[PDB]
mmCIF file of N, CA and C in Angstrom:
data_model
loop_
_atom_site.group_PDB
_atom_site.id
_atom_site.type_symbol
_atom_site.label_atom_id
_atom_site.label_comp_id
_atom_site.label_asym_id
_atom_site.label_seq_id
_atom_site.Cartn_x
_atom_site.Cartn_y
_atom_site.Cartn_z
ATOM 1 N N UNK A 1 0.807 -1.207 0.000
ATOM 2 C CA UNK A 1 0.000 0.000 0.000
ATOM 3 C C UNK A 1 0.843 1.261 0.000
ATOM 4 N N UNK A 2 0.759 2.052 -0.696
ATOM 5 C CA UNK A 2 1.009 3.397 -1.103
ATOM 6 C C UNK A 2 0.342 4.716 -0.654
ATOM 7 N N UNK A 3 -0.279 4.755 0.367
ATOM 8 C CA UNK A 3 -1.609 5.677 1.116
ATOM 9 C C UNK A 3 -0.267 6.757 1.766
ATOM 10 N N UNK A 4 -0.717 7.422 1.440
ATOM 11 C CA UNK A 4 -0.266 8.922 2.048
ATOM 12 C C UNK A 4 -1.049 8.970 3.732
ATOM 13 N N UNK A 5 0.077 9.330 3.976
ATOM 14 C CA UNK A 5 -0.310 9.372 6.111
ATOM 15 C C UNK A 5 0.180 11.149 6.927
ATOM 16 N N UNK A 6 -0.500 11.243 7.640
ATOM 17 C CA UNK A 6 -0.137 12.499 8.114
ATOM 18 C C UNK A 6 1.343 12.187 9.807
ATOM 19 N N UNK A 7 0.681 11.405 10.200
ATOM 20 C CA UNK A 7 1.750 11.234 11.212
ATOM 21 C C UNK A 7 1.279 11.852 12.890
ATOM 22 N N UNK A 8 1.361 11.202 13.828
ATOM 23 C CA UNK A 8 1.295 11.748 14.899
ATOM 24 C C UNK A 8 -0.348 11.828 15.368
ATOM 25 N N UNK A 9 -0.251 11.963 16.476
ATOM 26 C CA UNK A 9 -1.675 11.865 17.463
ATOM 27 C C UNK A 9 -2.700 13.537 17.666
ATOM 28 N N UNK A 10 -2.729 14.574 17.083
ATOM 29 C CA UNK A 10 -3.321 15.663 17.755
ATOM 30 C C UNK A 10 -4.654 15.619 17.820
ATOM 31 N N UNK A 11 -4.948 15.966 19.265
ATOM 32 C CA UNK A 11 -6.623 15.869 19.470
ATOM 33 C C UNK A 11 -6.589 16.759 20.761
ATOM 34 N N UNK A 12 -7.855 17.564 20.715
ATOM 35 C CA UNK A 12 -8.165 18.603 21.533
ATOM 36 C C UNK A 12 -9.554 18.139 22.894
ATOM 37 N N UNK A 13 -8.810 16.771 23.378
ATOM 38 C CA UNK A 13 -9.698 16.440 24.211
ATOM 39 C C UNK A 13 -8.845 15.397 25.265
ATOM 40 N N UNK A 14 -9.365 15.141 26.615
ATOM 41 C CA UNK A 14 -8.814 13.946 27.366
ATOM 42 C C UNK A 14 -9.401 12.878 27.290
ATOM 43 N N UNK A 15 -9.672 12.131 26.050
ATOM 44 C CA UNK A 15 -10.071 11.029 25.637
ATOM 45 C C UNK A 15 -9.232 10.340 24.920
ATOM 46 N N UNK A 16 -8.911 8.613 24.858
ATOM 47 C CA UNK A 16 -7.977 8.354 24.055
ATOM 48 C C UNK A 16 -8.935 7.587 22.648
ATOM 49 N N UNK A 17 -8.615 7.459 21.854
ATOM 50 C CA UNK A 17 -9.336 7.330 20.455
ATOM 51 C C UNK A 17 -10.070 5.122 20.845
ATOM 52 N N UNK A 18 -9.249 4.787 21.112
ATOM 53 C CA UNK A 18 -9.563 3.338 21.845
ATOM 54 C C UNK A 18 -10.776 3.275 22.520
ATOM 55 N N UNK A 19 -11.248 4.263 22.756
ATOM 56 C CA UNK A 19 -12.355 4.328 23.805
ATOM 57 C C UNK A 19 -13.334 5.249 23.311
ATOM 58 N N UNK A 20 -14.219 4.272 22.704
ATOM 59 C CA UNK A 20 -15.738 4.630 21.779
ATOM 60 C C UNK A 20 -16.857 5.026 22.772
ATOM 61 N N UNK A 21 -16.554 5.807 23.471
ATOM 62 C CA UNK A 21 -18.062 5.797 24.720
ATOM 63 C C UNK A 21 -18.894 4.891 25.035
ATOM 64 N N UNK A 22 -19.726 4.408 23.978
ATOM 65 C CA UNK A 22 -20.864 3.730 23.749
ATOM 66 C C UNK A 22 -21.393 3.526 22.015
ATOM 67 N N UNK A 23 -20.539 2.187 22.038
ATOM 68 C CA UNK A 23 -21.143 2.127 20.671
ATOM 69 C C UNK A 23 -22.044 0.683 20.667
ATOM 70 N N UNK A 24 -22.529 0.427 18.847
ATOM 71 C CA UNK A 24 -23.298 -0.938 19.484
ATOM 72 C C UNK A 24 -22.435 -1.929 18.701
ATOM 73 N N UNK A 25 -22.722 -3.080 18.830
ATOM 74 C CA UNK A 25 -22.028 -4.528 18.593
ATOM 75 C C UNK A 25 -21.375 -4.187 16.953
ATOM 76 N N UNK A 26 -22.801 -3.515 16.707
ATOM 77 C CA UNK A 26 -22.380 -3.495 15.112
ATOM 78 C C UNK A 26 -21.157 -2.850 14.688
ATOM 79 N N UNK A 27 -21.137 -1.251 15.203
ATOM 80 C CA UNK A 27 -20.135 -0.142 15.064
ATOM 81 C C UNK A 27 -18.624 -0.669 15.533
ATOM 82 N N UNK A 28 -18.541 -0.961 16.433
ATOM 83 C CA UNK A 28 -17.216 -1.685 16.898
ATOM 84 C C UNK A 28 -16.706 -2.711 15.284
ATOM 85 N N UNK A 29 -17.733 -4.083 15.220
ATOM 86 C CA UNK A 29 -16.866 -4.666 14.010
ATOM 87 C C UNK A 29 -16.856 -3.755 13.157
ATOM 88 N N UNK A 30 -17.560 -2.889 12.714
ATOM 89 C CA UNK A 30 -17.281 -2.177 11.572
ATOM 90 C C UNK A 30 -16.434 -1.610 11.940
ATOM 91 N N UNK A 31 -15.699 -1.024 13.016
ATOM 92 C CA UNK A 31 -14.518 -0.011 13.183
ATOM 93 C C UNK A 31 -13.671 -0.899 12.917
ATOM 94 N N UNK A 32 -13.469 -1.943 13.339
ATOM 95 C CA UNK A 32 -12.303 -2.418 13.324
ATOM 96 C C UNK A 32 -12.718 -3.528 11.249
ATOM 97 N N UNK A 33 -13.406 -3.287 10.832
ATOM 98 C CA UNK A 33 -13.581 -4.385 9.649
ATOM 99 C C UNK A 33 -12.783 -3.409 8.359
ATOM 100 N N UNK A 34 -12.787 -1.939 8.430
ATOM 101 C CA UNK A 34 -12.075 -0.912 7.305
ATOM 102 C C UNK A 34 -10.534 -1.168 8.183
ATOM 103 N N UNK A 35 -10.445 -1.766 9.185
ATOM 104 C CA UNK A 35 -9.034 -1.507 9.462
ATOM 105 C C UNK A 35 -7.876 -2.657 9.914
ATOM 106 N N UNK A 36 -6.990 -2.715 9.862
ATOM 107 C CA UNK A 36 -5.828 -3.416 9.412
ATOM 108 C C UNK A 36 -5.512 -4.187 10.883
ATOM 109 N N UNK A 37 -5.452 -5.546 10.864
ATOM 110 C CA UNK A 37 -5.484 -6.345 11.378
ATOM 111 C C UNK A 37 -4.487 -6.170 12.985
ATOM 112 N N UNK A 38 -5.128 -6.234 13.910
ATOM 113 C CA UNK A 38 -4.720 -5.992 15.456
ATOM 114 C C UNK A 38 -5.171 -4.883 15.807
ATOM 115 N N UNK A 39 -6.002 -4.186 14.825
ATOM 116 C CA UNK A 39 -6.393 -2.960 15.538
ATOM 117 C C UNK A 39 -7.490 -3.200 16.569
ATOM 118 N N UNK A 40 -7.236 -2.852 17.813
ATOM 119 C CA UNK A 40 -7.920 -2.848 18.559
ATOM 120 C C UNK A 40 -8.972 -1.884 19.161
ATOM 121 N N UNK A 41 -9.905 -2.003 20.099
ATOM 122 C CA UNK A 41 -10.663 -0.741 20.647
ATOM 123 C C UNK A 41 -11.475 -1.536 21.835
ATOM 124 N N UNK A 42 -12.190 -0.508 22.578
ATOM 125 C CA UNK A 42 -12.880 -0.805 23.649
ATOM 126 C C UNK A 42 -14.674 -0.305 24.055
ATOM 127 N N UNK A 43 -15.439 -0.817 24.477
ATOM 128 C CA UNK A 43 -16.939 -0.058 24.114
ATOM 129 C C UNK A 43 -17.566 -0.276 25.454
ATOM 130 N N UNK A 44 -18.007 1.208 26.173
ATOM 131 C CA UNK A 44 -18.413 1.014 27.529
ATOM 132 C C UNK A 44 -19.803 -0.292 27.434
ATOM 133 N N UNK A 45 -19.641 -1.345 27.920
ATOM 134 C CA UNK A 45 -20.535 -2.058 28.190
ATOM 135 C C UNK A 45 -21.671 -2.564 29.215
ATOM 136 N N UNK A 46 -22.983 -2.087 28.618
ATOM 137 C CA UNK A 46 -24.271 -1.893 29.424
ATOM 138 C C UNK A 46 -24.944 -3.412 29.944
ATOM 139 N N UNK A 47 -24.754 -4.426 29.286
ATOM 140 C CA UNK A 47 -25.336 -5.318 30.048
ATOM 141 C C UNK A 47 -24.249 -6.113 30.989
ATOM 142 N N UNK A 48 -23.538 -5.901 31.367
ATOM 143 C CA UNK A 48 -23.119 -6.436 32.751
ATOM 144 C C UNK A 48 -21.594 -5.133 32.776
ATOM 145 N N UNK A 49 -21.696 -4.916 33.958
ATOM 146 C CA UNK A 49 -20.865 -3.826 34.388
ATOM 147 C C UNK A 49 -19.506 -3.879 34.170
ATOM 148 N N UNK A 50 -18.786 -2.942 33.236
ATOM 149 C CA UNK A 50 -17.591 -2.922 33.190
ATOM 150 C C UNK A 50 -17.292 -2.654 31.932
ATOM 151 N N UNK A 51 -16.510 -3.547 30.595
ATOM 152 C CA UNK A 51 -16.537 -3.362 29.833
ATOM 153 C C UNK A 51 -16.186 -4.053 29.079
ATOM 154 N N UNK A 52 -15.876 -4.081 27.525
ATOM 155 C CA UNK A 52 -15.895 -5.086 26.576
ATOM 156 C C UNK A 52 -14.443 -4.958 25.753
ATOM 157 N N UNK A 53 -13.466 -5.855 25.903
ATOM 158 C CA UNK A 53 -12.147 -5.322 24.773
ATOM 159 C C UNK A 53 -12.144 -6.441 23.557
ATOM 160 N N UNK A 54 -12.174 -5.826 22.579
ATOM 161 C CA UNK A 54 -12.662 -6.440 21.224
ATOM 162 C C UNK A 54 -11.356 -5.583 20.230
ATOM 163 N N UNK A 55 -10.837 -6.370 19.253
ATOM 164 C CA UNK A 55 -9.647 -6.183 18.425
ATOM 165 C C UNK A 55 -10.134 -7.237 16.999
ATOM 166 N N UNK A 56 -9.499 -6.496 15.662
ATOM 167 C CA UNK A 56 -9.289 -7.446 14.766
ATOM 168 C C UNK A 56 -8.162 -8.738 14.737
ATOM 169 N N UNK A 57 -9.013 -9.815 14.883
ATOM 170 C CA UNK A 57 -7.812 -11.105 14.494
ATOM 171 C C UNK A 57 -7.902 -11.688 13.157
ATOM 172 N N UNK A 58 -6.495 -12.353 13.167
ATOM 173 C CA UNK A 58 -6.679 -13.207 11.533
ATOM 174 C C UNK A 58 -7.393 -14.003 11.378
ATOM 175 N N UNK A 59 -8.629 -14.594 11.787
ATOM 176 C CA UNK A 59 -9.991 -15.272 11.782
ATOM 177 C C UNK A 59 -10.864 -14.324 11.804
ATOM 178 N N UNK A 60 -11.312 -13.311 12.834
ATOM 179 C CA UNK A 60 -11.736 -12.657 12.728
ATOM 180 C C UNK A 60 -12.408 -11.339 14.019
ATOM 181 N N UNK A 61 -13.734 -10.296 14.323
ATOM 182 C CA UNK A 61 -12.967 -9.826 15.026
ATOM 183 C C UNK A 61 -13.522 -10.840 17.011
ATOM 184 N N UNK A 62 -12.973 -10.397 17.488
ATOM 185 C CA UNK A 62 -12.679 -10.948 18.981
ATOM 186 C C UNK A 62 -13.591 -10.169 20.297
ATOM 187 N N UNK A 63 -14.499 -10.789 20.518
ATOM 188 C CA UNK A 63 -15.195 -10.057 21.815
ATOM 189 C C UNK A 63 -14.675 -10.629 23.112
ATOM 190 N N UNK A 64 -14.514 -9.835 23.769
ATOM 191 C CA UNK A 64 -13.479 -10.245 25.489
ATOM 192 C C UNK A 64 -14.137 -9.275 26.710
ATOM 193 N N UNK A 65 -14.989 -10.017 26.901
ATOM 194 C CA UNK A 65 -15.572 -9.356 27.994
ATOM 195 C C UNK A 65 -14.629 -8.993 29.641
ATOM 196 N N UNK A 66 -14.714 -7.644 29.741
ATOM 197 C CA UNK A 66 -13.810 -7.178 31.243
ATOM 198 C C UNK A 66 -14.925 -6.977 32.834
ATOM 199 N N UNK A 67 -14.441 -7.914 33.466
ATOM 200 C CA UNK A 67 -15.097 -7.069 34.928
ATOM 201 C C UNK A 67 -14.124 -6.340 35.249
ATOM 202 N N UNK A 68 -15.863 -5.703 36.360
ATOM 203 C CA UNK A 68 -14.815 -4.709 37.414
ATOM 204 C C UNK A 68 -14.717 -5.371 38.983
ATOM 205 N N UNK A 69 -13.544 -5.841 39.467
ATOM 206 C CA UNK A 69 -13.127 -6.203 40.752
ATOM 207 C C UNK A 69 -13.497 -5.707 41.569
ATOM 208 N N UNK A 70 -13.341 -5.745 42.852
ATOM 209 C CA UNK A 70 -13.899 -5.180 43.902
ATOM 210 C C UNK A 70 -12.993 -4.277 44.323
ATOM 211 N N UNK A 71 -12.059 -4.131 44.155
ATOM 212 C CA UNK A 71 -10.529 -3.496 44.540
ATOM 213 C C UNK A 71 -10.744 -2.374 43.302
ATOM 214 N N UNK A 72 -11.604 -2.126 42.894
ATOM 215 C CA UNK A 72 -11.829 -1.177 41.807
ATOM 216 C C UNK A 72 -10.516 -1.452 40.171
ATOM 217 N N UNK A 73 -10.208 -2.627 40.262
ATOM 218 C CA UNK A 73 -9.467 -2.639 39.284
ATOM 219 C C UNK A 73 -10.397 -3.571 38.033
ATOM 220 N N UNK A 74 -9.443 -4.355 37.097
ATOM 221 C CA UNK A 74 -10.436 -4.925 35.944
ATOM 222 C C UNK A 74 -9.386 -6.101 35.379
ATOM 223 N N UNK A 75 -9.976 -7.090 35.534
ATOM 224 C CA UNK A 75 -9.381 -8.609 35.050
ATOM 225 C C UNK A 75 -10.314 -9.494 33.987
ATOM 226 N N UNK A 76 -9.834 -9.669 32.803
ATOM 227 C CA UNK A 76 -10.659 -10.534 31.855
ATOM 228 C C UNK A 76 -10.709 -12.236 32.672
ATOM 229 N N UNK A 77 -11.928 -12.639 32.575
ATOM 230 C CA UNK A 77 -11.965 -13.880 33.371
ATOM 231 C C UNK A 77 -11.619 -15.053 32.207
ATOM 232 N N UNK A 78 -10.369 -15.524 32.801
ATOM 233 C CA UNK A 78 -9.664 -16.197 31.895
ATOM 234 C C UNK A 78 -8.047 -16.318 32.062
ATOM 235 N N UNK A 79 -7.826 -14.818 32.185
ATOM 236 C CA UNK A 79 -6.443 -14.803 32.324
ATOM 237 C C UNK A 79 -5.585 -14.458 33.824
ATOM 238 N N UNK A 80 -4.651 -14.302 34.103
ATOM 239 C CA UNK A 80 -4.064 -14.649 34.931
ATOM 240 C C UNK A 80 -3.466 -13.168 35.798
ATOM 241 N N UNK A 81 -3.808 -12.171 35.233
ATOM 242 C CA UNK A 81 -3.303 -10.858 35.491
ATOM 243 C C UNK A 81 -4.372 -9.385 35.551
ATOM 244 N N UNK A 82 -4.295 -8.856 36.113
ATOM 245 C CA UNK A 82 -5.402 -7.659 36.495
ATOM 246 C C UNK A 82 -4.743 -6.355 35.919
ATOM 247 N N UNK A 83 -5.422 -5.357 35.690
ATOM 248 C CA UNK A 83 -4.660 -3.701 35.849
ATOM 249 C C UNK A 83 -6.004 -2.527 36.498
ATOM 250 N N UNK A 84 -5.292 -1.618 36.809
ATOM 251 C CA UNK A 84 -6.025 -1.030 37.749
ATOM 252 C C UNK A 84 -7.579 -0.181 37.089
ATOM 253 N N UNK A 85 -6.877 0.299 35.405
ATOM 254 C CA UNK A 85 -8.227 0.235 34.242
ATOM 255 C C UNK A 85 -7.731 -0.241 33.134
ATOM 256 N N UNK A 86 -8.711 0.193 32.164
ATOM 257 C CA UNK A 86 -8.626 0.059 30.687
ATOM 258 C C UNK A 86 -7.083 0.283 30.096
ATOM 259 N N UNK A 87 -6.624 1.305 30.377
ATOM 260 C CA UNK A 87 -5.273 2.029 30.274
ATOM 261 C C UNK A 87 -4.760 1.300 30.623
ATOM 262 N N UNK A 88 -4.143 1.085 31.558
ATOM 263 C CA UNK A 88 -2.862 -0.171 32.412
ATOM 264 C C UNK A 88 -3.585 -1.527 31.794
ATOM 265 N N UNK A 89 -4.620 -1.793 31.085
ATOM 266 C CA UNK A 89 -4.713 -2.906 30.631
ATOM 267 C C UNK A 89 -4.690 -3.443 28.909
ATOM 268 N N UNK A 90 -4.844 -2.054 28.544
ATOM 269 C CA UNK A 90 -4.679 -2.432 27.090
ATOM 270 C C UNK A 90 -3.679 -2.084 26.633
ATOM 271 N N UNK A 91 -2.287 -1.685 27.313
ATOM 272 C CA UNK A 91 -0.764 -1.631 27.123
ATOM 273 C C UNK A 91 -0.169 -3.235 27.290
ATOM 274 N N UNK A 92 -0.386 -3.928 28.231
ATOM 275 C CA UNK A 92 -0.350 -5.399 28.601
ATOM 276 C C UNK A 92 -0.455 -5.630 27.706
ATOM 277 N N UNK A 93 -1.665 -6.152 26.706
ATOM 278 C CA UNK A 93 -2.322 -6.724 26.098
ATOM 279 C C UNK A 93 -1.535 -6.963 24.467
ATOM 280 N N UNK A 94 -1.255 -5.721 24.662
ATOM 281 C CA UNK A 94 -0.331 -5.260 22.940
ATOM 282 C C UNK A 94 0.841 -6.237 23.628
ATOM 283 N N UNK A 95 1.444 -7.090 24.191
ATOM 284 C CA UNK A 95 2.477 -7.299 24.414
ATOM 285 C C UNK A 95 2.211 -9.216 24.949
ATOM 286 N N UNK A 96 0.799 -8.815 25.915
ATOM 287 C CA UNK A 96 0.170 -10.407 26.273
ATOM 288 C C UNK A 96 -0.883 -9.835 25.665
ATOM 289 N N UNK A 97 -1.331 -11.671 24.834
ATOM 290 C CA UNK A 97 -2.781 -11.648 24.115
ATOM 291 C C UNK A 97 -3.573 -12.232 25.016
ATOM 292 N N UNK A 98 -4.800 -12.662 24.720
ATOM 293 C CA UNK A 98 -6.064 -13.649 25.390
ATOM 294 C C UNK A 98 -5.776 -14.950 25.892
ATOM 295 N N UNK A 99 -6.416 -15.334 27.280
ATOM 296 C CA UNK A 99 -5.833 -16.747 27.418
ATOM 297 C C UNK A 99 -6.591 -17.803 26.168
ATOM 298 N N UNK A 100 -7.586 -17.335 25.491
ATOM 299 C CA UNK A 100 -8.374 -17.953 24.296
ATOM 300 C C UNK A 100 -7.439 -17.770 23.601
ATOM 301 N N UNK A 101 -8.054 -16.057 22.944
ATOM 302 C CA UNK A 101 -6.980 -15.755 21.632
ATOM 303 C C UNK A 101 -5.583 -15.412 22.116
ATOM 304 N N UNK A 102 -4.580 -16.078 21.109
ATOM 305 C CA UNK A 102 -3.218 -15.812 21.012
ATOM 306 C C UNK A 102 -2.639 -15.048 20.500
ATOM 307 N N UNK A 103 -3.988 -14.002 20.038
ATOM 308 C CA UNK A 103 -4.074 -12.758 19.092
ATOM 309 C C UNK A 103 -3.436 -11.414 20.016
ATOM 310 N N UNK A 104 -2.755 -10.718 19.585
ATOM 311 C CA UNK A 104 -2.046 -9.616 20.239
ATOM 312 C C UNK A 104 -2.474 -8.350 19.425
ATOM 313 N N UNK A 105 -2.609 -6.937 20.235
ATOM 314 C CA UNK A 105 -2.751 -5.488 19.610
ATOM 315 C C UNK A 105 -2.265 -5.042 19.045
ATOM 316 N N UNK A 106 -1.481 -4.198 18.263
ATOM 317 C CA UNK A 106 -0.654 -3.466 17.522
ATOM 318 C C UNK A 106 -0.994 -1.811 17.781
ATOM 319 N N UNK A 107 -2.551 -1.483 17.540
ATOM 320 C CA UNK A 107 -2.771 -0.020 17.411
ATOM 321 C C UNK A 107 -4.283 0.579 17.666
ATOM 322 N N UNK A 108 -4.311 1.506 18.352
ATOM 323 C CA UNK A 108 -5.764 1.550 19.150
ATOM 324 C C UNK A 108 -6.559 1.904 17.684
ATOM 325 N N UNK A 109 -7.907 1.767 17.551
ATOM 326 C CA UNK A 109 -8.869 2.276 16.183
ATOM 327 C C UNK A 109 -9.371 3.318 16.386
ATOM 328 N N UNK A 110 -9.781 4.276 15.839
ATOM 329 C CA UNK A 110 -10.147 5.480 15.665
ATOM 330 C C UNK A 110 -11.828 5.443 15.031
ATOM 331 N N UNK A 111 -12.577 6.335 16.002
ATOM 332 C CA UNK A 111 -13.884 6.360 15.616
ATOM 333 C C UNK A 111 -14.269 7.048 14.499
ATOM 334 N N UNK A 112 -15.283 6.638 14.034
ATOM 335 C CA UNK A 112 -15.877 6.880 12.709
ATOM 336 C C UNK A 112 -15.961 8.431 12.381
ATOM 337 N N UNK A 113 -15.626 9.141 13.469
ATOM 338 C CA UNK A 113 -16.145 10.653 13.100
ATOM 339 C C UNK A 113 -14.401 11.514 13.789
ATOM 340 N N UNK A 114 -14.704 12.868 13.448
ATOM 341 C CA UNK A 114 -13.700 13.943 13.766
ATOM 342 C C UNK A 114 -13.512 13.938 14.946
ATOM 343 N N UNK A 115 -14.536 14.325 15.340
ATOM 344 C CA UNK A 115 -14.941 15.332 16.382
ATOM 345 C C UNK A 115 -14.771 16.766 16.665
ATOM 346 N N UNK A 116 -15.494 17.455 16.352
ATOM 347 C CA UNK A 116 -15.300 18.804 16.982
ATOM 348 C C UNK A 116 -15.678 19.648 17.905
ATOM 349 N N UNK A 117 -16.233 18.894 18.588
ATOM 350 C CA UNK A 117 -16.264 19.285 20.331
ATOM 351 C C UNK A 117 -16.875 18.126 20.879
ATOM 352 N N UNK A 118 -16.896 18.583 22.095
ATOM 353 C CA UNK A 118 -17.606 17.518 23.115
ATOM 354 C C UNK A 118 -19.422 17.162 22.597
ATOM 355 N N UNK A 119 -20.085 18.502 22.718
ATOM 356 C CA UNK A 119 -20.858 18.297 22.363
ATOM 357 C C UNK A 119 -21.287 19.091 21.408
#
């Protein structure tokens, strides 16, 4: 591929692009289905408390459901290691994959829109 790239992260908010507020089942695969394999992301999840970390694999994409501990931290039930959130846990992750998938992160996904303000 030959795609012209701009380079670098600028955004005028304390949000990191990995973290879709609230999207639905659908929007997530589609974020990650235009984009290049390990891209990962995360989607606040409403039916059981906590949240959901989902990435493209080479099969295809990966739902990984996260609790929240009582110690206020967050451990996928499965694996062997906790972090205190999302952040301290989806740095791990790019490095350790799923005790399922053996699939690893590469690069957070970017939501479907700009944004130009909050609201």
């Amino acid at each position: 591929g030959s795609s012209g790239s701009s380079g670098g992260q600028l955004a005028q908010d304390g949000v990191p692009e990995w973290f879709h507020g609230a999207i639905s089942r659908e929007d997530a695969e589609n974020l990650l289905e235009s984009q290049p394999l390990g891209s990962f992301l995360i989607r606040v999840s409403h039916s059981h408390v906590g949240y959901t970390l989902s990435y493209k694999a080479q099969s295809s994409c990966c739902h990984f459901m996260v609790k929240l501990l009582d110690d206020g931290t967050f451990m996928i039930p499965g694996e062997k290691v906790a972090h205190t959130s999302l952040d301290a846990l989806v740095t791990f992750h790019q490095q350790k994959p799923i005790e399922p998938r053996r699939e690893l992160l590469t690069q957070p996904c970017r939501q479907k829109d700009s944004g130009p303000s909050s609201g």
